[model samples]
Target chain A: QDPMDIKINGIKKYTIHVLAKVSASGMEFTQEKDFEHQLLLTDMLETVIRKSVEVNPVLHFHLRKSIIMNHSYFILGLNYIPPAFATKNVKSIHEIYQAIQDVNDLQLLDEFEKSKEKLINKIQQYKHSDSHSGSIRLKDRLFADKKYGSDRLGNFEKMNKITDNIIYAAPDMVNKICEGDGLFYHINDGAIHISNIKDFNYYIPAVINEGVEDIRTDFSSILTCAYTFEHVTDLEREILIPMFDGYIGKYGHSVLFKTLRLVDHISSHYDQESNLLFITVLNQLSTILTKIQHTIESIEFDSVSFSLSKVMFENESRFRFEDINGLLSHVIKQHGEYKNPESFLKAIQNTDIADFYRLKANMRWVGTSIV
Target chain B: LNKSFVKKLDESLNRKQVGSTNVTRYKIEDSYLVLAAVRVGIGGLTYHNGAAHFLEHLKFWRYGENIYNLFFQRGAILNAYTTLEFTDYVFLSKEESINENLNLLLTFLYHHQYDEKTISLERNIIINEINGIEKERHCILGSAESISRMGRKEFELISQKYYTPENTSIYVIGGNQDIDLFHIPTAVMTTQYGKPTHKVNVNKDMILLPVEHGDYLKNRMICHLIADMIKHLAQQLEYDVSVGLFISTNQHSCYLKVKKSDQKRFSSLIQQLSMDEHFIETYIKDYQWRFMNELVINFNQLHNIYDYMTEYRLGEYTVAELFGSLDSVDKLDILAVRNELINQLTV
Candidate 1:
């Protein structure tokens, strides 16, 4: 009743080896080495069939069909190896014979069952592998976290910090600055010049005051300043030059004076009040985060599933500023606040609340803008 | 039942030539059904390459369109092929549409126009599309080189010579087996302007032998490892690359090619690749599952394409028989057997 045995005629020894290999090795018999062996078996079968055909050409049609069909199924099943034989094993050349055969037959049953069983066993074996087991368990845990309302508020805070760093630092490159330019300039010359100064403007101060407390607190703001400096440089190269050329008779001197004053004011302010600049930057950051959170809250729930249906439904009917503030307060409270939080200064000093507000703004801004 | 099928095939073959002036029809049967085959011989190979390729495209497009239209209107089975020696167009409809399908086929054979504009458009769409796909692969570089090595002048000459209408034959078999269909005077028109022939001897080379060194197998192993690493990176990036060990006895050389567009990452990754002994050993085992997964996907795709192409073409052989040749270990020797068989039958 062995499916392999029915096909074997002259190759008794080879068939036995194949049968043993398949049974002992299980689905691993489908491996490259085993596939090679099967191909060799097919070659032997073809040789037998051809010799038989030579004796009787009428049999050639049947033998050719059988050899080709069997060999194709072998390779189609193997998937990993190229067919050892190509000329005879064309893509479609045997279904006609199958159609001619009786539908209710023992031959069909044996052939179908053997192929199906082998494939099923192979899949089952793959499922039992260590990697598959671990991946499945990890996926299950992620699903469980969604269902049980596990705390992800802390993760959201961490994510906000990461996003802020990326956005602030992204425009530090010349490419980023050049993106805002309306006109084309020689990129090699313009981009290089901007990138060089931008790099030095950000890195040099940080390098000089590597251990300073002020630098530690104001690092992100310092980086943002450099990024903004590069952005203005690109604007000058691309926009100001064209605008100057186009309208030199009207606003030439006034434009120059205004630009110089703006640059000077930014520089002196950065030098004199680094802490104030940092707080201002942080407040702007919080506003952006709040915009992002608002957008997330406003997103349509029909297309998206919320883990906490109660929270979603409650928020759906009500414009829940208190819920938003409560979530932010919890995060800020975790990081600690002033003894008696009063003005926005004390609120900003509460690092957790500051981060929470920033995150909310980011969620609103990013969710709306990105989508 | 078998005798009646043969009688109908005889009647169809001997019916009447509809439009073609160049074709001569032959009807044959092997007890089951009648086969009507048309043979045409046209000359000069290189000049005909453009025409031959154009004809192939037209045949495939028209065949598909006609069959689909027929299916929509009143269901019919049809197929066509352009081989080196011949172009065969075949269809099997009910006995009723045999004359109509035959007339339609004759109209195509005689009047299928290949104007410069149509040729250019179709060549761009099909031929160039194929070339563009092939251009993505490193293996194509090797294939092009190998073909060139066999003498590009000779290859082009042979390709053109074999595809010309002077050397072509068409075969159609099926429907209420009648030889009368063969007698249809199908109008055949051909443009007759002979270009200067390139006299290049094609039989100069036998086979290109593979250069052997002790490190040849080692190099192959390294190539496979590098290919696997590229595939792994592609998977991580959600790009698909059909990277594998592509062995061909005909080529006598091993090489790699990418058939996918987003595989530029793999090519870039290859630049940083340095093959070492340890890497090869690790890759051989590590890539087993990925390789198997790719093979499964490839096999399924191949099976589907094979089945569709065969059915669409109305080919004599079935998908399983044709595709099964891949696994036949004795396939290497069967080429000679098939050739001998053909010769014996012809003689």
Candidate 2:
């Protein structure tokens, strides 16, 4: 779909990118062409703003100001998207304000200010806000990594929308994340909380660099992170379901492989000294990789056997390892790996080993390139 | 029958024969055990009703008079069974006459001569075993088909066919080393294989689910890929709103990726999945297998590799070949397999 232009002040303000429909059950979204500037707007806003403040509740929506653009150039999707009616009632995008000349006061019936006590309490709540801090603003960090540079300034307001959306999805999403696979990683309080590790890693500098501290780490934060991000089991299901909500799984695999290599490359540029966060990240990776290795061994062996048969059989052992120093090293052992009716692996272990060439002949006779 | 002789030896030997029959021997002192299982498999037992089991009974019956005296005199403990996959006849004895026992065992392979009286008696007994069977024939147990399906002559012919060396393997666990092949009967290499009774490869009606670790991973990959595709198609086909796939499972049954109202639709969609084979022409390339280091054998269980090898003339496939079969399963193979599975799943 072509990027829809949201007209702000009768001129274009922001280009609407991907619109995601994120509800209480973890966020699900859709894509459009050229997903760059204003990476998330109209869509996230439209669904939410459409769903949320139909009252344009809370002066937040209640008092949205408007400035018209050059009569010829109106910025898109402004008038601060009206959160007025139901999802069924909409022009499908946010309200575009005509900025043909000067700014217009969002003329609302101040006559609508019905209560005084209700207003004062909201004021006191704001005054009391900073006295406390949550150790985990987990959602904020997940969102931050997916963006770059100043995509931030425009996002936090959308962030408020995101927060609500995450909250809505928290119940279902939290359930899934907790119910998910063994290894999981989430950023919290300038650190990472991994499912496999009981304690969160509090050492990464990106924690400080990302400008986060006194961050709140609570149930909500953990839930939001799990609901939003991909987990190992998530990736596993991607392979199982193949279509994976519609994305190709092998692509995800390639991306993961590429990420591993990319991270490895990035780390090489900097020595393994000074930063404990770097150490923390490595520790997490090692922990994850080890679990991943176990998972692959136990779960993925059937799939990879024929696929990686050539590599596995070539100068490679059946009980192989993806050791770090080089892609090529694994312990070569055993007598006869497939000798009897018992456990096949037992042959790979304590049993008297068979001749490699003879085994190769057996495989060739059995008939795959795994020979 | 050397009633006074005793042989005590604790040793085992593994040997290969020119006949290609591999004998796995485990020698333990004091007792002799012989478990002879045919390679023909219950699946290959010419779908004639009760042919395998009837033949199993006849194997013991025809030779019962002489063989029983031959071995039982030496106190051999004997028993046998015909499983859905294969049939085995075993005998155990603490004898110095282990060689005599092994030789007589070899002779039984070639001696499946069923008399008219023997055949008549065996058929009625086998038919009587199907006592509680109803006409509908859920067709899931020992030869889901009726035993009356096999005729007397057809019965004897099948016995000869399946009992041939080409269709059976002799497994001697504790026995004499010097083996004679003259008793190991051979016929012009009869390759006429039989259809299985109830070979399970993960179907609803199968007596057993596939148990190979290889099959487990394959199914996981297959199921996920298939379910996701179904999700996409269902959404695009008749959807009026944006709804994500929701899956829920509690104790008894599972609710797949759709609403209660649209379950029928989901079922038919799966039908289209089973019935249509072209959808996978581009599947392998599109959904390539992801290779991970340190693969383990958590559950190669899902595959009755031994039985399947018997079922599909799959001896050509060892571990790699079979895994490669997973890799090389072409349009034709998949289509045929789909058709077979079509019966087990979805109406």
Candidate 3:
């Protein structure tokens, strides 16, 4: 008789995945009318249902080891996300994640982390109950009083952190997808159809540039790169010197070298004259960003004291209507940009355009693309 | 022979027969790997349910820790696995302890001993193994795919039938070249295995490349090119979501599978590889060198090599021979292999 009772609780916890496919069997359409008119993943225009290619979003999958339970989980999204909580595939969930974070950018969120914490707390409350308008509600709450990101065009990256993770579709550029603000999404065609935002192919061009890996080298070079990245020691694998890890294909390091025109780490080693020109472009961007941040601070002070002035926090902070008007009157006394609050607001809007313009240009120097 | 990739001592590679078991030995690379394969795999002519697999775990039950010390004391590692084709035991260690490891492996086979406690412990151990694969249940189809079985009668039945020596073959690579491999088949091992399924006729929109399987060396090399080509193309196309192009090759059948939230991704590379023989000619060596380097690096690690052998037989194929075949393969031949095998799946 075998009295070994070791087979009791080692059973697997099942993860549920649901997939549905749609087919336009015997359907035909053209560009002027657009197939989008004929079909829809959601009953919205393709231009609206999908996030705009203009703002340029990228997808990132970060897998973190479990602390509360067993196993790991993926913090998957279609935008650049700095690891939260002071940070944050193999194809195995290890290798693929390594491929992502090492080459792509790391986001540092210390700037807006207080609001991030409040949002995190709000998310904790949602876990216990069910609500539909949670995302829009949180978005409004997070951007309360003043806007620091882009203009009314929206905070494309910030909103995506919520939309990509929960909504699983792009938010409406105008108002809502179904126009009623209720949740809506569509699915169709075979597996090859780029039906969802989660598909990396759709978002990656916006993430790390138009091309991911440089495919131009003799094919073996890429394989050695993958092996060096995956199989070898982390130290030994990091042997792709000068070039950042992701850039190496047929079109000549895709967009990394393109960026070297801006932030070339060792470009002086080869050509000093070109490297100087690279830094000159970088200096131009650095100047614009500096002024943009100054304008943001002035606007922050202006909006908090003037408009939403009665707002107060749990403890240490409060905005007063009198203080803002008093300061703006003094600024008028000082001829600050020498305009009224409305014109100053317009300047904020104007600078938002200019800042984004410079920022987008600078980003292209690296592998990121802007429309 | 390319000494840069692998340095082999041809004079050292040899094979020996001890009692009813045969032992093959070689030393070309790595620390030391002692691989012992039983001719009876988990599946064979008889229906043992999972008895052959059960017996593999049971082998460690008797004198388990003593055998643990047998290798552990020598700063070595020992383990075994049962695949669809064969059950293999692997003992890995430094160069200095090869003979001691081989001698102890023989002791494990011939002077076998068992008792109620060891049997009971092994029963739990074997059941523990069954429970281990239980964690990966959802990967197949959630809870429904779990292997449901075992107790007392099944273990004794399997051990008495399959664990005998004559049904086993052994090979010791690296370290000791002329090591003795032995086993006597007192009990004949019979195995049983399969799954139930329904084939639904779907829209034949999906590309089903029925990779025509044959000629071991050529098939293996060609399959390598396809997998790499698919991977390279996916990266080129910026197919960000992971597209898996896993090539699973057994003794007779070589299957290259693709997934797109499914099981394989073969299309992207086919688009590129079929760019013509010019394309194939340009990248054959690249694929060859890349694939060979990965295989060699993985194979050089003893822990990785032994389990890998459960998939393919290694004693007959030298490291030199593996690459020689890889390099000799032509691009047009590659294109023919690529074109002949790939097409849309009809079912």
Candidate 4:
């Protein structure tokens, strides 16, 4: 049962993955020349795509709307209350148009002698309809289900139980590893490779879950999931390719190639039978991808073009997570042989399964457009 | 109209011949009125001489003190002065007590006893007060110096001799012009003094005092500059600090004083900045120039204080006499000569 074969109703799903290696291994990955060169080309391509969108008005508008919606939870969370006139005169989109026209027609009359009778009639016609309560109630229920619970205490308790369960489960893994080591071991290219999975585990899950809850409360759950997948895709576009290509260009192709092989081996664990677990893993990977996207976004490259250029250069090589993780592990091990690998092992054990599941579910929704 | 009134008029006309030495009194009809007139010659000198001037002051103080004490319940208005030319006393009260006030003035004038100690003490007090006035930096010293410089010893001599009773003349104006209703019997009895014969030579230089111009010139110039500048600067500062400047021709040497607090700092600052000789020279030059070019010759507008003082005295002088006195070109010549001397020394 490979973890990446996440499907809902036989649909392909995508997810996020974040990898962490020791400081020395991360340095080796950065020092790779081929990776750096690949990253440069990927960056140039991404730049051209972005610039094309920017200069085209329709494309610019579309991107702007997408960005705005992706960020809309912050707007909804503001508890917006429309102005009194807006609320009073516009019960629906149809009423809003009517009110606007009425205002325009009245304005055409001579101000000194014009009667306000037409304006008053228009206002009365635009007043809130009885059906407004049903829509408002549905929105309220959706918000509550996403935030508090759908079945009263059912989902609320389930979330609390899950959080508590994870925290309790964390100690078993924490005890198994030494103070500093890669978290996962996998066979890649017929050789044993170790991946540093622990450092990314806690933060990735926490942030992704927070994003999920925030989106669900402020928007439709389907939209929330759609945005999560979109953000994950952006991670590939913005962060991973740039980082991988940058490494390859500086350090050469051999190190990058080996890293990709390791990612392929770990990704092969995905199969059909354990689809739920696979979906969960994919969700975790997607969240990691989204986070890396965020981290790259947060870097504030000199220009958007430079950032997009970096992404276009390395997008292909960026496909392998496990290989990249292996190279990073080897770099760490060669630099500093740990006195106690078990302390490190214990620290990196518990998988971020919940985040994996979330990413998978979000990706399913992104492709399906359920709403 | 009546025989007694005619006799009284005749007696008054023949005041020197009769040797009838009682105070003569007259009164108008039906009002609280009395007048006493007296005439005395050298014969009365034994009784009057030094005593009359002292008597005048004592009379004024007593009556004025009494009235003041009665009304304000504190003696506030008691005052008297003796000048070389004349001595007089006056007291005032509400009209209700006009008779009592008149009686008090008369009794204090005629019957009051003068002690040597009281006279001596009063003389020292007066002399000290005059000296205090002399110490004043402006016109008070100026007047004293002028008299000294002009008459010298003669001025002092006259001050000594006629400052006593034999030279004094008294006039009482209130209550009534008539004297008989208040039982004032005869004018001759009230006459207590004869003129003294110590003749003062008017030819003597009365203004002989040497003027010391060092500190005195500095102070005077400082005060004048402060006043002038304050007037000029008043518009910009939005406050009135335009104190009037006064130069006393009477003072042998000039010194400065400011009437307003705002001008004091400015005056001090000017004093610190200007050299003594330069300031004195400038001040004297300005004074002379003002008089010759601006005033006596050209007749420019008079300063406010000068105009006010002159206008204030207009009612006191007969128009004929005032114009006659002012017409003396000799006075202007004297002023010009003085201005020249000051200009030479200071400027």
Candidate 5:
């Protein structure tokens, strides 16, 4: 035997991740899509998962667990460690969960209370700490509430109402959720034990998708950017599309700056001394946008072949290329009718590129001012 | 070196620019990682001394202790390092938590509140780091004297100048979709600051030589090739000496490091080889092979694209272009660099 080849009894630990597709009462209807109900459900389920591990003596080694939250799904990450010296007591994850299948609700209420206090203490700690990490976490938590979108200023009353609601959540209701939800998965080394897979296939068929079929490489796909053209008039479209294509080539690939520059150019012609011209252009643009939305309803139906990359999570979504193409080519057809350059200039001479920059700069200064 | 595989590897990389930041995302099989870098680093702090490195340490605590543990608990790790020309923050996460971890890292980037107590404590920490290393070495951790010169006020000034959105780049590997565009703080106008005078140290075991007139990138590569050739030749003659090249500050000059024990043998070997054309030609093919092999490995490595992007962000040529150019680095280029090395050895 080699001197360096000294081996001793040690358990081979594996951390398996299981992602479950979650649905809440108001997820699809909500604007900006907050994970309020899903979060509470996951929080309660996490307590149940951990408490199950605690109550079951055989699962003493599998105490290490974490909850990973994605917008659409939640992952239960369980690390299982079996005893190295005692081979007789060793159990697979399947056997371990089988042991907890019949675990009754007599002690779950107590565990739910315990889990609530633990989470409450974490939120309390976050509130008390002056550390930047705590503030970000707390903000992230508050932002999950659907009401947060309405309260853009993040007032103290709004914060406390959200926080208090989280604190005052009913234990019995959560316990009921924990009891009914038996679907869980343990994905190990590319092999998934489908305690859960996911919901049915979702796709947008009108959008044509194409990509290089290279089995050797996961990275072979075309990159794409999205552009909005709600009210782009033919003359506006003729001006903006050429401007956009030119600047994209000129300025390398700064995405937002391309729009900012175009907006700035349009805004530059505004009579800064006169407010009427600025307001007039703004009204004109709003009118144009409203009409374009109607035009796009029909135009966006035309399909363009777009190179689709694999969405890491199993989801089929359309990448809309027709919207951008129509925003350019459709306008070129009507561009010949409107020949006067002065009329094009007259229609687009007002905006606030500078004010937006000013506000952004101020916000950054406030953040930077602390140092 | 018309290696089609190398060219294909080069073609695989696609770098996109958004605002001033360069963003490149690679679809990695079963991997989740994001690497973000700021152009400010130890080199940026030549005036403020150890401020860049000191800022790196303090910025970890900028959001407080919970960030690290939060990262750890979520099966992700957050780490950063201040190098010669850039400070890079990297985190590895499961696909589920990539966005969350990325947000945490971006939070750590800006919005630093410097406290005097933390500054003094970190100063001691960095000073201890410098003392353990045992010399006024050119270290990324920085020197103690430099540490002494740094304070909260100095740190604040340097952080404001360097830590801007314009100076940052983000690179992600193994994410599901191209990350949605996020806004960083808009650019600020920071006026240029003058460089501080630096003292040079003379070493008995090492020789420093400046590449007088040529492209910095090409010069750096050739100087590296010269170093490898010297090491290979010394081994062939069984001189029991080891040698390597050290790129100097600003990439203008290079230092030849040798084992002090074998200095006599190494110096003699360099002198002998500079005069012998046959000896140089004999090892030339092997040295060229070594260069090509190293480039192949660099191209093959997963993280090498990040390295290439970082260099590109710093206004340097891509590794693909550099490697192609190295193929043109002929026997004459090798001899010229070798002669420079030999001159330094005698001096």
Candidate 6:
């Protein structure tokens, strides 16, 4: 309700976006160069923003960046601002831009040198903390580099030199960083025309997808589809619950149903690195279930699909699955294809009878059978 | 499923004691993670409250240089934190870096040097961290007064008395190499006996319930089950508020943190929970399943198993023993705790 602090159902309404494309003369991404590119670009933008923050300590911004296929974008959320105290002193976007433009080489270099150790330590933390399977999954999804799944680790010695080189070339590249898109700035829009600029004699396309409001990831898109099937608790209890039991070692939640919530917070940062492979498999199953739901009216996939979809849908934004990363088939490979009923029946043959006995055993217990 | 999971854990999980140091090792193929948990924290040594936590913050720079840099240089990840009854130091690395990083962990944990200058430099930083967590309602550091009252003497004393081999346990996940280390002298340990020494009146947001020490594990398990329910309930609210549960197994207590504004709603939820026999029974079944899976997840993830085992002193219990305790939890036990939990809620 407050105009000064814009939000829609407690979610922020406004977010600033900057897009950058691989320059024409930019070195082709190799396994070796993948992390180097990430470190330099992120550090470069971070240095610029830190300098801007120094210029205006009154404002605060939230930062998130992602690479969708061939392009990269930085999301700057206007996280906080002091309420308008006076008419003459009303804050404007121009002030933020003014501070950003105020980024200078000496200032940038000074911050970079001082903060590089802390930044490197953070990178190391993320690297060692992740599961080997998770890291491999991310590497496969993000980079043509092909060595490690969107590998985060770079040779530090090489990274150290690249940092020096990027900082040395900072002054030349600072202004041109925003020169790509047709409009330098816009509000609540995604359409942008990208162009290229040279930094360190390598062509880089720096584009801006300014003031974009719809930041839905593909995993977010399917959550809506899943939320529609909330009525089918049988899908949750029967199929989805059993499926989750299989992967509890890989993901938590034997006890926590609303399994989506368990998976959503499974590890917040891991969510960013890889799409929920389970969701992709469910998307495939949804198609199969729709076919089966029509083919045989008795059997339903809605129970399992609905439970998964509900959890993911409830946690829409947290599960980011940008569309551009070509889908990997390994999810189904790990768990055999579920397209055929015969195969599915065969796979679960032994477990079906056990489920009956468990229920039978439960019914035979003292509480239910009491006089 | 339970038998298979328990069998796998029983076969793989190994516990040993070398010169008063309790070490639990779980072998996996890739990644090397070593976690050291010391059994001294906020609940004990009440004379200098927050001394354990304050000491945890200083332990990082005890070598006069940040050990984080050393670990990072070797491509190992390093982190540490203080709980109500433990201070944990964890590092994860590749197979090649195990001995080196383990040595760094030992060096970091074993040594203690405190100066007035270092304490003063770190005072506000530690205070700021505690202050921030206080607002988030995730704080275990007892009171504002406790932290402010702490100084170099409290930190030095905490280090001298608590940071010893007998009081510490090291957990290793992954890698096959045999680990050998020199022994340090052992001292007789002193504990804060009786009810958990929580500074209950100090933080309005925190509600510490006196759990029966006679059945500490079962009571603590019930607290976690209820806490999870409460947390889920809090998440479903229209307004933004969070509830977190922290249990002190050794102290025989568990505490919940919620915003002061939402305390009434929290109390209402507990009262509602007392009536829901179906919900309690279903969650009890789920808790049993969850405990089994938690064992598997911990082994696979290579860290949390140690955090739980060391913090709760589960090192003394086997996979079968712990799972048996989990299995023995019946509906009546949970219903009883549910009523106790309702009675325990602060207005």
Interface RMSD of each: 28.8, 35.9, 30.3, 59.2, 20.7, 22.7
Top candidate on lDDT is 6
Say which prediction, candidate 1 or candidate 5, comes out ahead on TM-score: 5
Q: What is the TM-score of chain B alone in each candidate?
A: 0.35, 0.47, 0.67, 0.32, 0.75, 0.75
**Residue-by-residue lDDT tens digits, candidate 3, B1-347:** 23532443334445556655555555543221234333433331123345445455556554545565455434444666554335556654444555566556545544334565765565555456445622212222112122235445655655544545554556665444455422223212222311112121111212334444445766666766666666777787766433332233244435454443432345445656777657677678667655543453344333344433434445566556666767778876666666665445212
TM for every model, in the order presented, reads 0.25, 0.28, 0.39, 0.21, 0.42, 0.45
- Candidate 1 lDDT tens digits, A1-371: 11221121111010000000000112222122233223223333333333323221011211111111011122111111112211122121133222222122233333433333443444355445322322222222322431111111112222222211222222222121122221110111001001110110111111112111212232322111111112222222222222222221122222223333333311111111011111011144334434423433442222111212222222221211112222212212121121111222233222222322232233211001110
TM-score of 5: 0.42
Off by over 4 Å in 1: A1-371, B1-51, B59-74, B131-168, B181-183, B187-347
Which residue segments of model 3 deviate by more than 4 Å?
A1-371, B1-9, B28-40, B43-53, B63-66, B69-75, B82-84, B94-100, B106-153, B164-167, B181-210, B240-250, B260-265, B268-272, B291-312
Q: Candidate 5's residue-wise lDDT over A307-346, tens digit each?
A: 0011110010001101111111122112332222223333
Error of 2 at B312 (Å): 6.8
Q: What is the C-alpha lDDT of each candidate?
A: 0.28, 0.31, 0.34, 0.27, 0.41, 0.44
Model 3 C-alpha lDDT per residue in residues A1-371, reported as the tens digit of each score:
11221111211111111111111112111111221211121222222212221121112121211111111111121222112101110022233223332321111122123333444454344433222122222222332411211111123334324321221222321122112211111111100111222211100001112222222312210010010011221111111111121121112222323443343311111111011011111134343333333332232122322111111110001011012222212221212231222233233233322332232233222111001
What is the overall TM-score of model 2 with all chains considered together? 0.28
DockQ winner: 5
User: Which residue pairs in model 5 clash with each other?
Assistant: A132-B63, A133-B63, A231-A289
State the lDDT at B207 in candidate 5.
42
Tens-place lDDT per residue, model 6, B214-295, is 2556666666777777766666765345666655545555556666676678777777665666887788787776665445
Best by TM-score: 6
* Evaluation by lDDT, superior candidate among 5 and 6: 6
lDDT of 2 at A204: 16
lDDT of 3 at A228: 9
In Å, residue A127's CA in model 1 sits off its true spot by: 10
Better of 1 and 5 by DockQ: 5
Q: Please, what are the lDDT tens digits per residue for candidate 5 over residues B18-72?
A: 5444556544333323333333333423443655677887876673464665665
Q: What would you estimate as the lDDT of candidate 5? A: 0.41
